[PDB]
Assembly symmetry: D2
Homo-oligomer: 298 residues x 4
């Protein structure tokens, strides 16, 4: 089973003028590796893939891959609405040395089932890398049903997992029974902090969630505790991850909040975000702070 | 805090010709009390309130209350679309000796906010009993937001809790922070088996869920374990409750399944259900059986 | 083809204490017949069926049927969530002399497809009367798709039409092609004033909409104009019906508004509505008035 | 009032290997101008903006602008999820000679209200051109409410219209009353063929809809007829436009269908579409043909 455990959707650090902040993004990568994470995912939602042009995303990927220098597995999010561009980026990711790619369903047009399967097949064929699906129906408006995901895993041997970003036990439970039921080593990771625990108890494999950027220890320790068979300990951490998602209510998009948390949790980096996102106002920065303090994360 | 802990939405047992099966419903009540539950809720969704006429519901309530004979707290679900009828039933519930009522939002028309608050106020005034709200947006098509529920608790001192039937951690978390944040002894119970654990760890109060009818021990034991500070034990039970809701996908409505489970789990009762529900076919009864067996509940 | 043309969802007039206002409801019936309508539909949504008990609805139906005295066709809305009650009422409607019944899909539980078809079959079998389906997904949360409605018309020869209450040309167009395509004399009526014109030009059959109660001439004249081949005239009326639905935005439910419009348009009747609805405040009554004046309806 | 009347969302013609087919897209432009249209909109949804990269979209826009050579007004759709790119393209559109731009709301993240207003303000400021908003909630998952659109027109004097792509009379009616009520010369165009008629009768201004590409005469004639005060004639055309949208059910996306219709209606052009779209199979091409024949469009 590939890409299990705690794999954060790493934040892309930018300068005040909007360029890649290499010292800062590198500093962030290094903290996260040091924290005991099982991989890293660049250019996910929290990486702000949807606010970057093709060429920019190529540049961020190659830098990120290079800086990681194979210390842990690296995933590159290559998705979007432009299928041809999805292939360019996915191929480039392979060339550039990535360990796999993460591909969301086209989210402008909700594409026919036939078209959707053909899309995913085509991208999976364009590379020899592992392909990790990415479901996020709240944003895509088209759910990758467990039936469909089983169909896709049956169809291509390199479609080997999924990040299920949804506040639903049923969806995660069904994803596990239907897909892992047919393919035991298919990876199922959840997209939200507050589902990591349940996702494990259901016989899933881990999480790619925002709290990896600023409190990676909680998820890493939850996982170690669970693998060590100490469940009470794991639940202890779950309890923190249960509360964490309050913060994300402070703005939309909440990439600003994640980056601001990174700072408050001890890593001084530029919190500049790309439009249509905006800086977090002062009042809500202090609210974030009080929240992080209550939870004992700074 | 009133009506905390494990309070099953008791199934109403019917004969083959559709009348109240008194021996059978009494037998069921007695098992559940014996199992260590903290209350009982008659004429909820699983009680089939929406398939019974006013007079029938009066009759079921009076029987149920009488048979319980004050051994545990009794809640009567008095809701529907006909507000005047909601008052008749709620008042009748009081005079019949019930400990409180459970009121869902009117689910045909999605009523204006002003009208909705006025409805709940009016019913809460028509009785001196505790009033427990009931949210089930999947069916009602109108969510009782934590804001609105805070407003209602602020408004009437006898609106003292809620059954939140939704597959969402966020909703339960927000319900707790917003409402309990303002009213510490406001009860918040979850409507689904797989959320009991999280609902506790969030500082909520228990569950009214279907698995109470056929596997009440699991939820009762989870709750005692948690109260005894043995979390690993509690999680052990959570793990079973996590799987249980597969059963409910076998039909819709799945009130047939719950009753069939009651039988398979050792309590022989008539599984007749009211239309537009129907008996569970043989194939799916056996599937239920294999599921209960896998989970070690029969 | 049965039940074509302009068939208003007649408002049920109540006294202050909530009883049937017979003088007033009779007065209303008489205006509407005198206006040239092609039938009348009692105990629809605007009739407030969902706020009345079984016995009350029986009483209103017989009174209404009797007072019409066969001058036009009469439809009785017998739907709800309680299937057995749907049969009692539907049978009672036949015994009481009604020309057909109108049956919405059960709107609490969104019932399985198999269950839904079996429900509609069962009620259609419980009577020898014509059965008119009623779709209103905005409130029911379960759409009667054209596929499903074709299935139902194929299944039972007395399922002979539908009131499609939805703000969608596509749905009405599809309902006509799929169902009328297979059953030419199947009736398709729209539920909203602003769709009557399109519904005709699509090869549908008429409307059961609220503006029948207070401005029945507009829809009656639109229909006559269209049948006389004078389309420009028909479009003239369409233009008024296009604007009428602004009022319904003054409250929810907006039965209060319809009844208040009946008064302002010249028919003094009690505007009492059943809870959880409430009287329309004074400011909004005056806004209604200005609207009716602008459109030249009072 | 700017950009009124019939302004087709022109199809971008591509070669087999996916490049701009200049002879073909020029041929198409010329037919449409010849047909009497009041403008042209390049790089809308039907132009496939969401499957083209920034540089490609630049290239298509200038070519299109140049080939039109000011014969009619030209609109360029510059929207997407990448705000900085939206400014690049919008500014490029101005320098390339476009008469205005068309900007959809960011459709990946459903952005906060504050952020959404700030986005639209920022883009409107980046140019001196007229800005035409674009609502399409079915795809975006975030509706541009009439309230919000009024706010935006109040905020910036160059936000001067909207393409409302929604199958809803209520939404269009409300958009007209709320926005035109405050700004009489604000343009309101509908996005669907079957709403053009109603949109006019409501006091709106026209349509940007797919049938402009292959049957522009129908909409052009409807508009001329209506302006000439001959309503019966206009309704005659409405009747065809009412049926047209059946085809769009043959695939999703249905850009393939539009382009195939262009061919069958007399203009031989390459029907190549960009992925994740695909060619229309033979069976469904013949079905399209039968449809166009029934409606007397080929």
């Amino acid at each position: 089973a590939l890409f299990t455990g705690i794999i954060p959707p790493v934040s892309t650090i930018f300068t005040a003028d909007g360029q890649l902040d290499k010292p800062g993004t590198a500093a962030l990568i290094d903290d996260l590796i040091k924290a005991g994470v099982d991989g890293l995912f660049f250019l996910g939602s929290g990486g702000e893939f949807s606010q970057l042009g093709a060429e920019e995303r190529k540049a961020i990927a190659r830098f990120a891959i290079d800086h990681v220098d194979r210390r842990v597995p690296v995933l590159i999010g290559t998705g979007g609405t432009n299928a041809r561009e999805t292939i360019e980026l996915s191929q480039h990711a392979q060339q550039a040395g990535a360990d796999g790619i993460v591909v969301i369903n086209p989210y402008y047009w909700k594409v026919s089932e036939a078209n959707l399967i053909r899309y995913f097949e085509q991208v999976a064929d364009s590379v020899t890398l592992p392909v990790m699906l990415y479901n996020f129906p709240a944003l895509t408006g088209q759910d990758l049903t467990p039936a469909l995901v089983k169909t896709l895993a049956d169809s291509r041997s390199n479609i080997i997992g999924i990040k299920d970003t949804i506040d639903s036990v049923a969806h995660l439970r069904s994803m596990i029974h239907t897909v892992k039921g047919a393919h035991p080593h298919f990876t199922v990771l959840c997209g939200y902090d507050d589902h990591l625990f349940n996702t494990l108890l259901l016989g899933g494999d881990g999480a790619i969630s925002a709290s990896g950027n600023f409190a990676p220890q909680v998820s890493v320790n939850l996982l170690k505790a669970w693998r060590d068979g100490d469940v009470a300990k794991a639940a202890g951490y779950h309890q923190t991850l249960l509360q964490i998602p309050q913060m994300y209510q402070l703005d939309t998009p909440f990439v600003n909040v994640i980056k601001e948390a990174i700072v408050l949790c001890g890593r001084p980096v530029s919190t500049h975000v790309l439009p249509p996102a905006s800086p977090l106002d002062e009042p809500r920065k202090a609210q974030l702070k009080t929240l992080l303090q209550q939870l004992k994360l700074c």
